[model samples]
Target: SRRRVVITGMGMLSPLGLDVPSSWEGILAGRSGIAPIEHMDLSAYSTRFGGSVKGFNVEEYLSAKEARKLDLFIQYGLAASFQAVRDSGLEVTDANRERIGVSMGSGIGGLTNIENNCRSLFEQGPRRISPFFVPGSIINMVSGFLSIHLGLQGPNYALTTAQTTGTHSIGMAARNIAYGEADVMVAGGSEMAACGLGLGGFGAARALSTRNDEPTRASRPWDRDRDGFVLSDGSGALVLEELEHARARGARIYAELVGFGMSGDAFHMTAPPEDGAGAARCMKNALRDAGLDPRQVDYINAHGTSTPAGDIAEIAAVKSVFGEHAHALSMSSTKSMTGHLLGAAGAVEAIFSVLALRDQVAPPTINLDNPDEGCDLDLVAHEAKPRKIDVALSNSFGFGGTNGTLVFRRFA
Candidate 1:
């Protein structure tokens, strides 16, 4: 009757690679995926380079007809979900169909699609708008289509909380299973903006890198020569199941999702408070939920987006919540390589956190040339380091002051 949840499978469609092994290898090897974004009006944008997934063919996962009816975000969500469910070895037959579900999300769902349709609406006519526009572009379709395709008849929905979208979605999915809503839940986030006004919007906000020459170096979190964050397109997913259910099926367990916590900054829409009070509270709550003391956490996958105020604020949050243990543990931002998958960032980072627990190493924050002041913790610079990581924590602080944290422990 225990309600514990375990991650049985993992998948991702990242700028680093199309699947989990390749992406995780890139993380461990300190490879960067940020590059010059193609087929865009670079003349009008400050950041010419962005992280776009290369060589992704939607037809590989969906038929040509179905692929044309949906946005790239939904296609990516399906791809990652398929990989994860397949990896989980969960068969959705008629008997078990009602016991499975999906919860996926995106930060800015189908922004490029909206921009294109707006252009078509003005230039063409009202009738030119595709009938699939509403269903295709909405945020829930990732979860919607995955459930329809997989015959998952249980709880299926998506969450949107800016950059915290994936973390919230995954956490809520776990809660559903813990509450006996379903036996297995496919959950994560997918995002594919970086085109048209999606690009122009972020560009106008002055939140992106101006150094067009070095896209790879743009995401240098906590660095003295730091700049704004880089945007990317990708999806990351995990298959979470009840521990007893998974054990009955003889599933391969990746890690036990011991805790999830959330908080709101209540101060700003885009900027976090300097003291990081809310961020610290979020971490504290997660550790509390895990019933583990702060001293037990050995690694942290930080939401270090390379922003000026954001990186140091997390440094402050770390110190505040972990106290003296902050210096004793290792921390790194995988965004230094993935370049901010936005809503999908936390899900991918959660996978990284579990891998850190399994492998007992701290992933590196590459391109950290010189550490910024107050960035005093072990940032695991340049290279991934082998360490004792029995428990791992991942953090996400998003726009609108929403924050979420996840705690994963090595599966015994």
Candidate 2:
């Protein structure tokens, strides 16, 4: 048997708010973070609306030299990691150096950096590009720089799965502790792809919402008027500590990470399986691994991206797994409030899920005036609701048909 794992601290840098408390408050109040595109010039793009995190002071969190060398994603990662480390209250002395690790992930990585540098390389020749371009554009550098920044000397790693990146990072970190490889880990995801190539790429694929007129009400998760996800940029992080280690340190534990499951559809590169078989299996597998009954779960933080196909398939997946209790479970998509943070979506949504357990309140999926027939579940639409929840699950399904689900139980 392995050790139990719990979340000791959390941090976030999202479109909703800068920190966890602020973001949670906004989510509980049903505020939408989606707005007009401000991070980059969207004149050339067809879809010019998204959720962009505003007023990020990079120098406030790290040295100017450090911030200048990395890409925006890495900056967000460092900022969120700083908050996570500060809130965890874990001493990183010489004795604990080998026991503390970092596991962070990003989907598109430094797309903006790579795009700009590539353009420079083409226009002004390779000699014109800065030496920091390579390191700045690498996805794993988010974890690498964080490890170096915080002196987290134990097993540093990162993942690159589209939307499942963050969930995979946290789940894999838990597995590391369960296998006795580490006692504590800083795990989460970060992304800053609201720029030209990043936004234009998704827009080219027709993956973003086109509600440029109603920016705040654009990300209508589970709503019949929903079109697609609102491209956003940000990060979220959590500190995971082994049960005994946390208890010995007198840490304020948040919740127990009981189960994690990952599945791949081996189907399309972009779309999920038709009936959501892969997604359903992911949830079932997580529940089985947690050794918990279906009825034990009280809430679900759905990865409802507000797309027509995605909204329907996810609800079907939930129905297939939860069966008769599907109608009873109060599920909601915080993406409706925070917009889609791409690679960072899982960790941000996980934070919301933990907040739901701690506050006994479920966040709202706003803009559901006309709910999709396929999205017939109790989506906690338009308004926040209070519910005493002890157990909750967060689901994230990404492109390439990758699916990840996490089962969390309230701390006793």
Candidate 3:
């Protein structure tokens, strides 16, 4: 028999706020975290704005000497994981330490470090490159650092599935516990790519919004005038435990992670299929995995990145899968507030969905002032809505035509 998984704790460091509670508070207030890129010299770029985490103190989470050994993305992941572990109350004892694991990832891991080191290699010499360059820039280092810090000795893993990194990580972590590989897993995603390469690459691809004058309104998902997504930096973490293990420990369950599904668009490397067939299938698979019907889902945290094709494609996908229930359920893109956290989007949004169930309220898709052609649903636009949420579905799609869906049900 398979074990059941439930989220016992969550932690987040996003453009909107530093921790889970602050981020959720900002989400419920419909606040936008998108703004101008102040950390770097963006005078040369056409797209000058992004959603950067503000007022973060690395020393607060790690010693100055220790933090210098890791990249920003790794630091973010470690901090979020620490917060989650503390919140979960899972004391890592010598006997139970091997039963804990970690699953964390990033879409574009350590781009800032890679860029800086590459510059040094060109301007200075190979010997001038920092010794920590390789480990800092690797995608798996987040999990590596997290497991080492917490002394978790089981199932250490990471993923780099572009935007779906977070969702895929969480889903895979749940499977590990369900299969008896581990009893607990710290799973999430982190990203810190708001530098020149991140912005320049996306802007060159015309995938980033150019609303420099109105940074706050740049990430307006499903809006008529929305152009593209805003690059953001942050991390989100969740502590998932086996239900029986949790109950035995008197853990406070947040929500039950009952379903997870993945699919490939196979149509385009960057753009999803116009009809949204692949996305629809992904959601269908998740619902089937959960043994659920469409009507049971009361809320959907959409993969609405404010892109021209992606937003409409997801809407069409939802309509196909949900049918009449699409209109009844409240679906919103919290990315509208947090910008697009890329690898961290799904994890952060999953946290929001769990909070929605806990508070019985749905977060809003800010700047949906003018809905586009196919976005005429109860988007819970501009403001949060108080509702009785039983089940919530979070969607994430990435650049490689990868898609993932997770179903979180209010624990009975």
Candidate 4:
């Protein structure tokens, strides 16, 4: 029989706060993490704000010498991983170290580093380029560094599925453990792509919101005035372990990861199907994998990125899959507060879903003052609502039409 998997620990650094408790508290209070872009001059860019992870100290998780060798993305991932490992209290002994694994990813790995190095290569010549540039910017280095630091030897893997990267990583990690490949896995995603190239590219494509005057209120999912997604930076992580292993160690179980599903639209490079069929199928597949009916889920952490097509399409998809039960479900987009963390969105939202199960309260989707048509479902708007959420589903759709869904149930 396949083993069962449970979440024992979670850690995150987001625009709201630098860690889990602070971020969750800010989320509960409906506080926004988005603000003016301070990393560089955005006077030339149309969109000038994003969810920036502030007050981060890399030395807290890595030595100064070690931290200097990696990109900011890797630093964020390692810091979050450290928090998760510490919270789980899963010491990596010689006997079990080989059984622990890592699955971390980034949507756009080291974009800032690439830009900086490229500039130096052109302006200052090849001789000025740093030797650590290549390894620092690669996507898999997050997992590599994590494995080295934590001594996880089972599965060192990474994914690059745009925004769905985090959810996919968690799902795949859980699968590895369920298949007996490992007893524990540290899984999640991180991103810090708030550089000139990132902003200019997205702005050129009109994929980001240009509400520069009101950064905090810019990310308004399902709102009629919403323009596009606001880019953000941060990392979110989870410690997933076999159920027996967790119980054996007396680990505190946060939630049981019941199901994971993925699909592709095969239609657009950056846009989802207008009818939301691909997204619906993904959710249906996840429910099927969980052996659950649509009516069983009590809440949903939507992938609503405050974009016009994305938000409506997700709502339609949820309606299609849940049928009439959609009216009874409480769905909210935490992205309204956290902004869009791209690859890290799903992981952070997954933590929020788990927290909802633990707290029995549905987090709110702020700035829903005027909901667009077809967004008539209960969104727990403006303020969090106290409701018993037994099972929660988190949705994540990426730029390449890739979609992922995770089903988390309250641990009994």
Least accurate 10 contiguous residues by lDDT in model 1: 38-47
In model 1, where do residues sit more than 4 Å from their true spots? none
Overall lDDT per candidate, in order of appearance: 0.91, 0.87, 0.91, 0.92
lDDT of 1 by residue, 1-412 (tens): 4499999999899989999889999999999999998877688778888788889988778899999889898898889999999989987898888889999999999987788889889999878898999999999999999988888898988999889988998988988988898989999999998886776888899988887987888889999888788999899999999999999989999999999999999988877888899999999999988899999989999999999988988999999998989999999999999998999998889888988988888999999889998898999999999988888989999998899999999998
User: lDDT tens digits, residues 180-237, model 4?
Assistant: 9999999999999899988998899999999888998999999999999999999999
Write down the TM-score of every candidate. Answer: 0.98, 0.98, 0.99, 0.99
Poorest stretch of ten by lDDT in candidate 4 = 36-45
Candidate 3 accuracy as lDDT: 0.91
Q: Write the residue-wise lDDT of candidate 3 on 149-236 in tens digits.
A: 7788999889889999999999999999989999999999999988888999999999999999999998888899999999999999
83 in model 4: Cα distance from truth in Å?
Answer: 0.5
- Candidate 2 residue-wise lDDT at 279: 92
RMSD of 4: 0.8
Model 3 residue 319 CA deviation (Å) reads 0.5
TM-score of 2: 0.98
Q: What overall lDDT, based on C-alpha atoms, would model 2 receive against the true structure? A: 0.87
Candidate with the greatest lDDT versus the true structure: 4
Error of 1 at 253 (Å): 0.3
Judge candidate 4 against the unseen true structure and give its global Cα lDDT, from 0 to 1.
0.92
Q: Count the backbone clashes (under 3 Å) in each candidate.
A: 0, 0, 0, 0
